[PDB]
Amino acid sequence: QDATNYNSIFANRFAAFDELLSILKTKFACRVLFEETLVLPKVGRSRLHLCKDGSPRVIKAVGVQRNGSEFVLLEVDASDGVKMLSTKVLSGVDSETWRNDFEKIRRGVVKSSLNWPNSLFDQLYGQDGHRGVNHPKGLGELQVSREDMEGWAERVVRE
């Protein structure tokens, strides 16, 4: 299982996501502890660990710190038109166990045909430790207004 951080060469696949972060740092006073983009693994006879063009599908994790609070954002590569509809917010994550936890999560995502393994999420951070934030309506199909881009951040911080 490849664990190399290919953050910069997959940066183009998270234009919307990377903009959300910028809004959090300026309008919501957030700090980014780390940014890592990892490859999704093949699990069994899985298909969606790849993109339509045969390239690996990736998942980006961003560690954030806001007013003492610390949480992790999970966003899955949707560049080839298969859309995730939500972003995963993880709270109460230990830096000494993240590398291993993430590996388990990636397997879980692919095993559920590109779906959040909510059960696994319960096991790790409890029912109140993880939540899903819906994407701006029609993301990837249209441009999102600056207010809606801020509203996206609002929904994230709301948690």
PDB file of C-alpha atoms in Angstrom, residues 6 15 23-24 29 45-46 56 58-59 70 78 94 97 101 105 119 121 126-127 136-137 145 154 156:
ATOM      1  CA  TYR A   6       1.605  13.222  -3.864  1.00  0.00           C
ATOM      2  CA  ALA A  15      -9.389  23.412  -6.896  1.00  0.00           C
ATOM      3  CA  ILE A  23     -11.444  30.945   3.190  1.00  0.00           C
ATOM      4  CA  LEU A  24     -11.025  29.207   6.551  1.00  0.00           C
ATOM      5  CA  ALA A  29      -8.894  32.223  11.464  1.00  0.00           C
ATOM      6  CA  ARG A  45     -12.038  -6.637  -7.562  1.00  0.00           C
ATOM      7  CA  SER A  46     -12.682  -2.929  -6.965  1.00  0.00           C
ATOM      8  CA  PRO A  56      -5.227   6.398  -9.542  1.00  0.00           C
ATOM      9  CA  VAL A  58      -6.783   9.919  -4.595  1.00  0.00           C
ATOM     10  CA  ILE A  59      -8.013  11.165  -1.231  1.00  0.00           C
ATOM     11  CA  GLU A  70      -8.265  20.469  15.988  1.00  0.00           C
ATOM     12  CA  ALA A  78     -14.135  13.506  -7.991  1.00  0.00           C
ATOM     13  CA  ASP A  94      -4.393  11.464  17.465  1.00  0.00           C
ATOM     14  CA  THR A  97      -2.261   7.042  15.177  1.00  0.00           C
ATOM     15  CA  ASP A 101      -6.105   5.072  10.900  1.00  0.00           C
ATOM     16  CA  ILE A 105     -10.168   4.463   6.112  1.00  0.00           C
ATOM     17  CA  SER A 119     -19.333   2.165  10.775  1.00  0.00           C
ATOM     18  CA  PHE A 121     -15.811   5.983  11.625  1.00  0.00           C
ATOM     19  CA  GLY A 126     -17.428   7.576  18.221  1.00  0.00           C
ATOM     20  CA  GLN A 127     -20.789   8.717  16.867  1.00  0.00           C
ATOM     21  CA  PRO A 136     -22.434  23.384  -2.514  1.00  0.00           C
ATOM     22  CA  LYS A 137     -25.291  22.364  -4.822  1.00  0.00           C
ATOM     23  CA  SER A 145     -20.457  32.274  -5.611  1.00  0.00           C
ATOM     24  CA  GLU A 154     -19.666  28.054   7.641  1.00  0.00           C
ATOM     25  CA  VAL A 156     -17.719  23.105   8.174  1.00  0.00           C
TER      26      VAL A 156
END
